[PDB]
Design a protein around this ligand. Structure first.
Ligand SMILES: CCCCCCCCCCCC
Ligand SMILES: CCCCCCCCCCCC
Lengths: 194, 194
């Protein structure tokens, strides 16, 4: 507003260039805004295992335009912040306690009471399974070749996979020793010709 | 702004032509901006194996409007930069260390302790498997006809496939010699007529 030979000769071009860039760079501003929101509102922090639209992995850092997370295998993934904000964010390592689910399929002949008692004994003897939570051991479904039970136990988000593996191995050992048998796919074949 | 018979007689047409081209060429400017961003921010460099929206292959070079990557087979692929930026970029060769996963399915009768000891011995004897990382060998699932273990070992991104092949061959050899048996699909057939 002071001189027309100092900025008008350059503003007439700078404004048009900026408008053209914004029109072409609209995605850039969208990503920048999404990143600013992600820094302000923290759905996930660095080092938190998250799943962003079917791409799960540990989050490394939220940058200006994209956030890079290292998956379990070890491959780096870069996701624009716009789609991260526009989609659902599943945070695996937010709640301190998570739940394990087992599906043990025993044969039909297997006694229900014995199986439930064995599963309850296995669940209780584990000190990493929170007792104040719900420990469910009940028959769930009558499968094609085996009735499968469901075991649900809550454990700290840290020692969850270890609890799962230990419980599964102990279940197999006890069932093998106790007498319960895991059945192979059973087929009933009938004959009509010698 | 100096003469109306020098540029006005041509600007009135040049501006309209440029506007029409930009309207028709909007994708061209979008691709150019995406390419500029890819050169500035480097999610992937030339010679880095990447996966861009379900199209994996070594990246050759980022051009003005598209980047050509040569897949594993040897076929060249050209992808506009706009969709490259708008999508997720998985970088396989960014982290120096990556993880291998094995799924060995042994028969139910196979002893768990012997199988785990054999797998651990195989894992440790390999000098290309990083010891400071996590070497997981534990029973993972009770399959329909075979309990399958999971082996996870970290190795340098360079000698990863070679490690996988060597470990798999050694596993087969030891299991064949040790006594462990890989089971064929087992079916339990019952009879109700002679
Ligand atoms: C464009 C509107 C922005 C509104 C910002 C709300 C403030 C959020 C702060 C939350 C702190 C945990
Ligand atoms: C349209 C906004 C462009 C912002 C450019 C940010 C600078 C990035 C430089 C990164 C160097 C590694």
């Amino acid at each position: 507003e002071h001189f027309g030979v100092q900025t008008a000769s350059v503003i007439a071009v700078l404004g048009a260039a900026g408008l053209a860039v914004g029109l072409a760079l609209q995605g850039s501003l969208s990503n920048l805004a999404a990143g600013v929101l992600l820094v302000m509102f923290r759905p996930f922090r660095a080092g938190e295992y998250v799943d962003l639209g079917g791409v799960a992995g540990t989050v490394l850092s939220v940058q200006i335009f994209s956030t890079t997370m290292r998956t379990a295998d070890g491959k780096i993934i870069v996701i624009p912040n716009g789609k991260i904000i526009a989609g659902n964010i599943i945070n695996f390592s937010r709640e301190p306690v998570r739940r394990n689910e087992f599906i043990i399929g025993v044969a039909y002949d297997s006694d229900i009471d014995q199986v439930k008692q064995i599963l309850t004994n296995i669940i209780q003897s584990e000190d990493r399974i929170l007792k104040d939570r719900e420990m469910t051991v009940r028959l769930n479904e009558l499968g094609a070749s085996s009735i499968n039970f469901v075991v649900r136990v809550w454990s700290n988000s840290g020692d969850l996979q270890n609890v799962y593996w230990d419980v599964l191995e102990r279940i197999k050992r006890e069932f093998d020793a106790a007498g319960i048998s895991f059945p192979y796919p059973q087929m009933d074949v009938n004959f009509k010709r010698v």
